[PDB]
Amino acid sequence: IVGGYTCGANTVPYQVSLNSGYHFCGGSLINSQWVVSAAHCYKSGIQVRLGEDNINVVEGNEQFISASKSIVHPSYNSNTLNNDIMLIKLKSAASLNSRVASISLPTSCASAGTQCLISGWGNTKSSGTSYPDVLKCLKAPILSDSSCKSAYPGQITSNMFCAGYLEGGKDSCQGDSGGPVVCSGKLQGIVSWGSGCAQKNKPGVYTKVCNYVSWIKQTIASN
Ligand SMILES: N[C@@H](C(=O)N1CCC[C@H]1C(=O)NCc1ccncc1)C(c1ccccc1)c1ccccc1
Ligand SMILES: [Ca+2]
């Protein structure tokens, strides 16, 4: 997260860190057994880390649970990033508490202008590289479809939305991938892609979760 702020420990209790020897992506806990992340975060050997603030120190509220199965969306295209969503099944159910909590799925899509919370342990620099230990947060509005398409001509599908700031300076970045965009208490986006981080006229692009709720619900009913 570039240009954001320290969230505060466990104030984003649905935020998970995906670990394969090191943090590599975020995700969102949607019930005690399932995490939503980005398809471009797929790899084998995932451990889901819940209840995290400082990802380099055991602070006492963590739950570390291996994935038993990952399911990349059947229609994910790794070239256009259309359908950039993946479900991860935990080997055992998380114990839900004030520091480890699920985020609701949307029933309606969010609207342009709605202010959302984006969070993660990704790079905090727009040029250069610095990775934080504690969770970072950014308040960002959803942008109009027309401004999003003007920023990324030919590349925005109906399964994507832009959020952030056309002036730059505030954005998600590498390592935030797969994490949440929450608006009015619902998971409306997944950190997906952009042209650099926090660059002028290049806001972040997010997977539009409301288009995937039927697939999520049917998949978790059968796995
Ligand atoms: N900029 C790259 C990106 O978003 N990549 C690389 C893999 C991870 C993800 C990421 O950091 N997502 C998080 C993010 C990035 C930028 N703003 C907001 C959030 C993109 C690309 C996407 C997926 C696969 C390959 C490349 C890219 C686009 C054009 C030129 C080069 C790279
Ligand atoms: Ca920790």
Curated annotation (Swiss-Prot):
The keyword Ribonucleoprotein does not apply. The active site is at H40, D84, S177. Is inhibited by scorpion cyclotide trypsin inhibitor TopI1. GO terms for cellular component: extracellular space; serine protease inhibitor complex. It is an enzyme of class 3 (hydrolase). Binds 1 Ca(2+) ion per subunit. SUPFAM superfamilies: Trypsin-like serine proteases (SSF50494). It comes from the Eukaryota. Subsequent cleavage after Lys-125 leads to alpha-trypsin. Further cleavage after Lys-170 yields pseudotrypsin. A cleavage may also occur after Arg-99. Not sulfated on tyrosine residue(s). Pfam families: Trypsin. It is found in: Secreted, Extracellular space. Ca(2+) binds at E52, N54, V57, E62. It catalyses: Preferential cleavage: Arg-|-Xaa, Lys-|-Xaa. Transmembrane segments: none annotated. Synthesized in the acinar cells of the pancreas. Substrate binds at D171, S172, Q174, G175, S177. One of its GO terms (molecular function) is serpin family protein binding. CDD domains: Tryp_SPc (cd00190). Residues 1-221 form the Peptidase S1 domain. GO terms for biological process: digestion; proteolysis. Keywords: Calcium, Digestion, Disulfide bond, Hydrolase, Metal-binding, Protease, Secreted, Serine protease, Signal, Zymogen. Its cofactor is Ca(2+). Disulfide bonds join C7-C137, C25-C41, C109-C210, C116-C183, C148-C162, C173-C197. Belongs to the peptidase S1 family. This is Serine protease 1. It comes from Bos taurus.
